[PDB]
Design a protein around this ligand. Sequence first.
Ligand SMILES: Nc1ncnc2c1ncn2[C@@H]1O[C@H](COP(=O)(O)OP(=O)(O)NP(=O)(O)O)[C@@H](O)[C@H]1O
Ligand SMILES: Nc1ncnc2c1ncn2[C@@H]1O[C@H](COP(=O)(O)OP(=O)(O)NP(=O)(O)O)[C@@H](O)[C@H]1O
Ligand SMILES: Nc1ncnc2c1ncn2[C@@H]1O[C@H](COP(=O)(O)OP(=O)(O)NP(=O)(O)O)[C@@H](O)[C@H]1O
Ligand SMILES: [Mg+2]
Ligand SMILES: [Mg+2]
Ligand SMILES: [Mg+2]
Lengths: 53, 483, 484, 469
Amino acid sequence: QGYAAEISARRNAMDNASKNAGDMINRYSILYNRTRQAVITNELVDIITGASS
Amino acid sequence: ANLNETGRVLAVGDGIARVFGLNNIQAEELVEFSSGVKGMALNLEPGQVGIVLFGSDRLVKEGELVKRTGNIVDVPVGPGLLGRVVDALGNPIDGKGPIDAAGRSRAQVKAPGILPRRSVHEPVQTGLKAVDALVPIGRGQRELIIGDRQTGKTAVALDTILNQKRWNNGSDESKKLYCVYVAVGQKRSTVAQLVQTLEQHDAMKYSIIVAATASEAAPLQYLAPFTAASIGEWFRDNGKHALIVYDDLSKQAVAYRQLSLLLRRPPGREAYPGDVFYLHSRLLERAAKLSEKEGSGSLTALPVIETQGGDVSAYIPTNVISITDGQIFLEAELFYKGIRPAINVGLSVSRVGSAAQVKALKQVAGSLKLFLAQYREVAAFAQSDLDASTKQTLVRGERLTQLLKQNQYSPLATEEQVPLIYAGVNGHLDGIELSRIGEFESSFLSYLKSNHNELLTEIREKGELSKELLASLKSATESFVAT
Amino acid sequence: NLNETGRVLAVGDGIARVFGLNNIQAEELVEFSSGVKGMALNLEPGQVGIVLFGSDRLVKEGELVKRTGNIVDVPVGPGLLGRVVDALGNPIDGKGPIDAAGRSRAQVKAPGILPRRSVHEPVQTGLKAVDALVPIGRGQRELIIGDRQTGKTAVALDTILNQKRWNNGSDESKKLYCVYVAVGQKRSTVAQLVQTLEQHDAMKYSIIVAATASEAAPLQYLAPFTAASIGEWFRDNGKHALIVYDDLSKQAVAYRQLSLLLRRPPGREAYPGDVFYLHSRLLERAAKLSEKEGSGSLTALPVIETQGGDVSAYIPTNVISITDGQIFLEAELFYKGIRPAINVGLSVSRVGSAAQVKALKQVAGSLKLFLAQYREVAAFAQFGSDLDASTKQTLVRGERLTQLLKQNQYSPLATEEQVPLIYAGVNGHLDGIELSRIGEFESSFLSYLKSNHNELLTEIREKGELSKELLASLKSATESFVAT
Amino acid sequence: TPITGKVTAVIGAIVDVHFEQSELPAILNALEIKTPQGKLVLEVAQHLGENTVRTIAMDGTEGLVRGEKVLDTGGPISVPVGRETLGRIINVIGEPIDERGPIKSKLRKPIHADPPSFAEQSTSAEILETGIKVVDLLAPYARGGKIGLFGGAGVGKTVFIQELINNIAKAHGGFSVFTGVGERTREGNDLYREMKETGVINLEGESKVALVFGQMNEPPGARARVALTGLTIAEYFRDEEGQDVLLFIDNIFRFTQAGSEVSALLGRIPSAFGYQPTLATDMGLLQERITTTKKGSVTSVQAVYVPADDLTDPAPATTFAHLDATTVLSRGISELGIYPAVDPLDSKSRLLDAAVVGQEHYDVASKVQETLQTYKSLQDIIAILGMDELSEQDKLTVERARKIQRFLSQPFAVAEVFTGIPGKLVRLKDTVASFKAVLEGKYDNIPEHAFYMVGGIEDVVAKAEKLAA
Ligand SMILES: Nc1ncnc2c1ncn2[C@@H]1O[C@H](COP(=O)(O)OP(=O)(O)NP(=O)(O)O)[C@@H](O)[C@H]1O
Ligand SMILES: Nc1ncnc2c1ncn2[C@@H]1O[C@H](COP(=O)(O)OP(=O)(O)NP(=O)(O)O)[C@@H](O)[C@H]1O
Ligand SMILES: Nc1ncnc2c1ncn2[C@@H]1O[C@H](COP(=O)(O)OP(=O)(O)NP(=O)(O)O)[C@@H](O)[C@H]1O
Ligand SMILES: [Mg+2]
Ligand SMILES: [Mg+2]
Ligand SMILES: [Mg+2]
């Protein structure tokens, strides 16, 4: 019983873990798609400045 | 041909036109080109003038005549602009003929300083159960509507305007809110279909549409919110109350970036120029409540910003958030589910509209503000326990969440709202099914209108709830809930 | 004739474009008729681009600019000791004229392949964690790197404060003279720092070269080089200087400002193409000379500041390339109590044990590698598991060794004080002691040895090494104190 | 017979003026153009050659014509200095903008001045008790020191400055100076009306504060210079009056931002992020003038905008080293309803040292910082796997950080309309004694919500009894 109590606490803690790990993947997918664009834009400003003079 | 009054075009590309001469032109003066297209004198040099076009470059050739105007960029203002749709240079585009104008304010006007203002205290009534209870907007305030693509942003502004019909038919000159809806970079059809919605609801008569749409040259879009401000300011300056809606400043900032990059200004954060904060700041600072020494007139701005994927830390979102007096933040996650208006309460604030809340709302919405931001506490940590203590909160919250849900084009009076929030706050819904909360409103409000119209008239008249009227609201709600 | 003099063509932003000056050398000092000095960095056909070492407010088109005939330089010599000067060596402590032995130029070549010797001498810092794990030798360049407010200066400062132990003696070879270069710091902070230095009586063997936040960028640019030259005097004359460059981040930034206003086409993050050379040539000057050159040393401790712990950023990568190792400081570790907030796994000293008193080397056997073992373990512990004896034994030891290496500011420790505490730690004698009592253990144990076993601490300080006779005595001493 | 030039070129805030005589106006001089309305003030920024100077305008350049006659005042923009500035409201150019006639002061000092020398530095270590718990406990401000409030949009900066004003200004002895820079005209009007309704400004008698405004409706010229006006006035009290001076700037970022709006029109190759190459030196020149000298003392509080909540942006990044105490306001903290939204860990004082605050204070502060940190080091695991996967030692230290976290929130007096709670003000000794006990684990039985938005220790006990039944 304890063991079955456990197996039903484990598939619950992990169910809630995946549901919460996916919430962080939403934060870090967006921040990434941001930081990726920012990187490219700032290298591009560097290139444009270097290309005026 | 004078070289002082007249010019010849040296070159034209990338939205700029270079003109030789115009030796008596003013910095920021409108010009007229051979073809009728107008421009602004942006940069004034030895031997040439840089002119930004208000239209396609196709419309200006090298070797062309350019005449001075004498006038700095401006628009017609006055009361004759109600029920009209102009473009950014105040040119009438509804086909309804010449604009009847009291005169011509400039596009760039300075905002009234520290002295000529008073604090906000009067309600801009939105008729939206969520806004008016939880984020009250004052007359003179600047409240930003902010949220992702397609989250009912415009809907809040629009239903606010359609709610003004209430007093904009009346005799009382002071509770009248004249409107200005500014379309920046929108589709031409959306704006035409939007007018038609102001027309049907008979709201068009007290509003003004200024439109610089998706296809129009950037400087027109850049210009549109400013020439809208001057149009609005007239009411503020003449002891009346105008509401201005900038829809949206995102697209204006985009237009302005185009202009800036074509002009080769150093691109900063997200390739916006150094001065994009300033672009908005000078705009939104022209909203004010004036002191009685200046005629008490009030401009009120509801600018719209579009976030990307819910991120409010982006450059343009944080700039305007640090200009405005609060944000109504609308959320893609709520809107997906049905909770519309999708006013994410936690992340929404009015900074000065406190004083401006109708007392009767403030009374039945007593700390509803800080409870709902805290029903959000348990509801995010209950998806962990079956607690009897914290299940009434989850059933106050859930009922209240359905109570603030609203159909569109259905704005409500103050008097219709206070008893709905009484029935919520005081728990009169706890036994009623969730799927019947929407049927409770419509049945209840009829029951109220058919019997208890004495109580409903009285909330409207006072703007307060007497202990008598609250001891009565108790009887009528318990009576209807039992049947 | 427009050879020795020229006329300003345009001016602003601390830059001046000068006509003429037809016989001026690249990098020569110039004088403006208004009083302000400057330096020629651009010699173009039409004109000379000049950066000023002050304001421009008093310069005007047409004004007359004058050759000095000299590549920028500074007064040098033991006369600068106890003094505070500006970038060009002008006295800013308002205590009158510096006396100069001579004048080194600002930009000196570094000693070559040949005039050198392997660093074999301690720069005893008196900080337990530095001296034991990341030991600094005379002639090394050791980088102090971290986010703002992590304790970078405190590391450099405690080191200066420690040299009092030797600087007060007759013996010159052991004496270590200190130069603290302030760049981009504000005046009140540099003030507050000299005030701390006088309280410990450390100013007398120091020189502050300060080019602060309000001063012309070219003053900030130049400061670390002239300070290098001021420091070089010691090295070049068989004495030993320590130079703290606090901080090279702010310097690079000035260098960037100076160059953009000269219109030199920018590079990465707008820095100048050669912003690496900027530091590489600065830091190569720090050296340990050969016998033929009198054995003098210049030890550099440059400081770098990162943003959000980003050690992959542009300048920090440059400087890490250059130095002989670094001390990494972390806010995360500072708030955990670990002070100095040294990241033991990331910090290194390439010079290594080579410049570390044998006494301390012997007691700190594999201390750093054990602390590495302690780190991996406290991560196997994190995921919730009680382990076996040996694994929880190293979990106990490393937790206390860490605590032992914690250390109050302005409290540098002598080697003969450090060796006992370490010996006590690594050999198990602390495992019996409750963790929140290790601090009080240290000072009591120290005071116990000073009064009772002074024999040993006198011997360790004298012989520098540890005979088995000193090991057996220490084992017998420590174990004795453990049983209070 | 004055020194006249003519306008050759106009772009935005930048106006190029040509001088017919070979006597050209010095850099930093104010020039003037007669307008139809009043007077447009230009400041000389550089000498372009061929008898032309480049200038920055202090107001909109609409209507300016190539040819326009330009006067040379032969001096930098001056401001009325002296006691006759108190209770008055003032332009970037000194002019009085409160309608109340002319500031009839006896003198007019330039807004550009050279910062005090190294010899003229006066270092101290004296705690400025603010009454705000987090400050007094973990990052205490310094009398004569420099205090910066970093925060993004709408996290709490202005309200924080407002409580600082309300707490320390009203009864301080010395004279205050508030300088609004690139913020809300409305906030100014709000502050003006406040100081009248608190007796700090008295129209019909004596006053304590001097007002200087250059807000976000102003051209970048005003926004660049107005911080120096405010400053110059604060220097006269410090130097020529020995006064301990309270200087308040809100917001100091808008000055750097202002300067980055002109930089390119002034013809400069941009630096990182679009900023002026002179960003650090422009800051040195301004900041290094706000300082306690031997003649007088200047405690100052400055709000620091952080753009796009990015502390690493060259602007706020550069500002950190100019400050004796920084308090950082965090959105993530504010979004939890904790206020002040102060980051207990990322906020710093020079004075958090046992010599100044007392060993006890220090020990308690450190143990509190230790506690919070251990929770923060465990966030990834709390979030994914939850509390139940921690060891019990941690589970205990976490449960205690959670309490201290809340116990650092405080009702402000000016924030009274958003909390709906009388604004408590807690003494430094009390804060120290209250946190010490919570560390000893005396109040573990007490639920978290009791520590939230209260004062000292007794208030938690009061709330704990209030909540049980
Ligand atoms: N209270 C409401 N109840 C139900 N639907 C609504 C409500 N408010 C708005 N909508 C609908 O939701 C959709 C998008 O709303 P809208 O007001 O256009 O948001 P938006 O932010 O302007 N989107 P866009 O302008 O395209 O970025 C439209 O079909 C609206 O009619
Ligand atoms: N060993 C130590 N133990 C405890 N506190 C310390 C220690 N060393 C330094 N501190 C304190 O930590 C704070 C910051 O240290 P500091 O030496 O200024 O580092 P920093 O990185 O140079 N800061 P900054 O120059 O402002 O970027 C100061 O309050 C110091 O007094
Ligand atoms: N101390 C506080 N307690 C409770 N709520 C606060 C507090 N400070 C700020 N807030 C809330 O946050 C809002 C913004 O605070 P405010 O002091 O204007 O910050 P700010 O950084 O000056 N804003 P901005 O300049 O526009 O970026 C207030 O109107 C309140 O709703
Ligand atoms: Mg829309
Ligand atoms: Mg430092
Ligand atoms: Mg603010």
